């Protein structure tokens, strides 16, 4: 009848080892794991009815006697981020049914934090605020104002320089809008650079 | 190439019909249709264990399916309701392993006048970031769009660029209480200060919007929000 996954989410640093859990009822079998990427594409990780399997950095165990299955991700990369589902066939039926998923975020280790807030002008009166170069421990608070917008953080990889950085963006039409005030609505580290 | 589903994007007015195609050329017998609402799991609509054979899944109401051949498993929405706004995924299995199509983003609206193209603007790197980091972040903002049927991309000197780019995973709602709030979506492109400070370099943020078609009848006094590309550009800046 049902597939139950857990933890509801997992956030880790580049390098950490990940374990996700799926508990299932005794009316399902033929368990499988999938990764759904941020673009919504599902790819099969394992068909895993029982035993343990390995696929590069990833592995999976199903103890069908104990009605669970475990997915292991070793040395997590930022590219492992997404949602992980287990799915199983309701017995007799070839009805393939899914759990609710576990969201996995793998954060980069920021070699050299330089947390700072910058003002960026429109290329064509209008500007935006960029909060960048912070370590992964920083959270970016939602806007506590109906018409100030604050994005969540995202990781950008400058591939050929082997460089990853976090950023969040904020903007508003308001007359009294300051980048000074956009992310101080939140709090920022002990050292955020605020030029001019 | 595998399980292929079409359209990737569609808008329906309440009451209209549509068929989601899914074609599979691997000779798989077992095929499935799922829907997934934002941040949720996949829920089974209908499945087929072989040509000519179809059965109800977990949530079949309002849907129909046929399997006249092994290759095709069309999903019909006979009479579109707002609850059928979802992403739809078709899958086949062989030997226990599942193979999924790319997804079909369907939005059903009560009135077409809630459909809006994005406005797009590019924000140039700040002098202070250049001085402090030797890097230069461009920001693109796409604002005021409904449905969230958009593809955002960066083009540098006429070529799509993938490295140094970060696009928000989730759009944000301009009016968070509202189920058909228009959205805002940001992206960043980060380059070395050297590359940005070259006036020979041309930077363009592009948003492909998937909008209404000429199956749609438009009454409003604004431009019909049809499928379209809205871009914004910036030239590298010495000064």
Curated annotation (Swiss-Prot), chain A:
Alphabetical keyword list: Adaptive immunity, Cell membrane, Disulfide bond, Glycoprotein, Immunity, Membrane, Receptor, T cell receptor, Transmembrane, Transmembrane helix
Name of the molecule in the record: T cell receptor alpha chain constant
Signal peptide (residue range): none
Role according to the record: Constant region of T cell receptor (TR) alpha chain. Alpha-beta T cell receptors are antigen specific receptors which are essential to the immune response and are present on the cell surface of T lymphocytes. Recognize peptide-major histocompatibility (MH) (pMH) complexes that are displayed by antigen presenting cells (APC), a prerequisite for efficient T cell adaptive immunity against pathogens.
Record: glycosylation sites: 139, 173, 184
Gene Ontology biological-process entries: adaptive immune response; alpha-beta T cell activation; response to bacterium; T cell receptor signaling pathway
Disease annotated for this entry: Immunodeficiency 7: A primary immunodeficiency disorder manifesting with recurrent respiratory infections, candidiasis, diarrhea, and failure to thrive. Patients show a clear predisposition to herpes viral infections, and features of immune dysregulation, including hypereosinophilia, vitiligo, and alopecia areata. Other features include lymphadenopathy and hepatosplenomegaly. CD3+ T-cells express TCR-gamma/delta, but little or no TCR-alpha/beta.
Primary location group: membrane
GO cellular component, one term: alpha-beta T cell receptor complex
Disulfide bonds: 129-179
UniProt organism field: Homo sapiens
Origin superkingdom: Eukaryota
UniProtKB/Swiss-Prot annotation, chain B:
Ig-like C1-type domain boundaries: 118-227
Domain of life: Eukaryota
Major location category of this protein: membrane
Gene Ontology BP term (one): alpha-beta T cell activation
Disulphide bond pairs: 140-205
Glycosylation site positions: 179
Record localization: Cell membrane
Keywords: Adaptive immunity, Cell membrane, Disulfide bond, Glycoprotein, Immunity, Immunoglobulin domain, Membrane, Receptor, T cell receptor, Transmembrane, Transmembrane helix
Gene Ontology CC: alpha-beta T cell receptor complex; membrane; plasma membrane
Function: Constant region of T cell receptor (TR) beta chain. Alpha-beta T cell receptors are antigen specific receptors which are essential to the immune response and are present on the cell surface of T lymphocytes. Recognize peptide-major histocompatibility (MH) (pMH) complexes that are displayed by antigen presenting cells (APC), a prerequisite for efficient T cell adaptive immunity against pathogens.
Subunit text: Alpha-beta TR is a heterodimer composed of an alpha and beta chain; disulfide-linked. The alpha-beta TR is associated with the transmembrane signaling CD3 coreceptor proteins to form the TR-CD3 (TcR or TCR). The assembly of alpha-beta TR heterodimers with CD3 occurs in the endoplasmic reticulum where a single alpha-beta TR heterodimer associates with one CD3D-CD3E heterodimer, one CD3G-CD3E heterodimer and one CD247 homodimer forming a stable octameric structure. CD3D-CD3E and CD3G-CD3E heterodimers preferentially associate with TR alpha and TR beta chains, respectively.
Domain notes: The connecting peptide (CP) domain is essential for signal transmission in response to antigenic stimulation, likely downstream from ZAP70 recruitment.
Protein name: T cell receptor beta constant 1
């Amino acid at each position: 009848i049902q597939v139950e996954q857990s933890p509801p989410d997992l956030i880790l640093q580049e390098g950490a080892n990940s374990t996700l859990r799926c508990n299932f009822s005794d009316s399902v079998n033929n368990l499988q794991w999938f990764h759904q990427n941020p673009w919504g594409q599902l790819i099969n990780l394992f068909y895993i009815p029982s035993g343990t399997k390995q696929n590069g950095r990833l592995s999976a165990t199903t103890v069908a006697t104990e009605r669970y299955s475990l997915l292991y991700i070793s040395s997590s990369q930022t590219t492992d981020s997404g949602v992980y589902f287990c799915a199983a066939l309701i017995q007799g039926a070839q009805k393939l049914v899914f759990g609710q998923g576990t969201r996995l975020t793998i954060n980069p280790n920021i070699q050299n934090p330089d947390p700072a807030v910058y003002q960026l002008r429109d290329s064509k009166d209008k500007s935006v605020c960029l909060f960048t170069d912070f370590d992964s421990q920083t959270n970016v608070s939602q806007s506590k104002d109906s018409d100030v917008y604050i994005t969540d953080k995202c990781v950008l990889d400058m591939r050929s320089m082997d460089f990853k950085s976090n950023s969040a963006v904020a903007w508003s039409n308001k007359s009294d809008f300051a980048c000074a005030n956009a992310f101080n609505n939140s709090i920022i580290p002990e050292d955020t650079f605020f030029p001019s | 190439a595998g399980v292929t589903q079409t359209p990737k994007f569609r808008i329906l007015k309440i009451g209209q019909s549509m068929t989601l195609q899914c074609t599979q050329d691997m000779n798989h017998n077992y095929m499935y249709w799922y829907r997934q609402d934002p941040g949720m799991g996949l829920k089974l609509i209908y499945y087929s264990v072989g040509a000519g054979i179809t059965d109800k899944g977990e949530v079949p109401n309002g849907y129909n399916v046929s399997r006249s051949t092994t290759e095709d498993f069309p999903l019909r929405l006979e009479l579109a309701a707002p609850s059928q706004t979802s992403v739809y995924f078709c899958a086949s299995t062989y030997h226990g392993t599942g193979y999924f199509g790319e997804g079909s983003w369907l939005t059903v609206v009560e009135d077409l006048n809630k459909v809006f193209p994005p406005e797009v603007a590019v924000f140039e790197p700040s002098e202070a970031e250049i001085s402090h980091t030797q890097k230069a972040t461009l920001v693109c903002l796409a604002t005021g769009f409904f449905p969230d049927h958009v593809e955002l991309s960066w083009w540098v000197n006429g070529k799509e660029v993938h490295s140094g780019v970060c696009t928000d995973p989730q759009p944000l709602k301009e009016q968070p209480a509202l189920n058909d709030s228009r959205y805002a979506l940001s992206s960043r492109l980060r380059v070395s200060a050297t590359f940005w400070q070259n006036p020979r370099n041309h930077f363009r943020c592009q948003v492909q919007f998937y909008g209404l078609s000429e199956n749609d009848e438009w009454t409003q006094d604004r431009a019909k929000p049809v499928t379209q590309i809205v871009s914004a550009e910036a030239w590298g800046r010495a000064d």
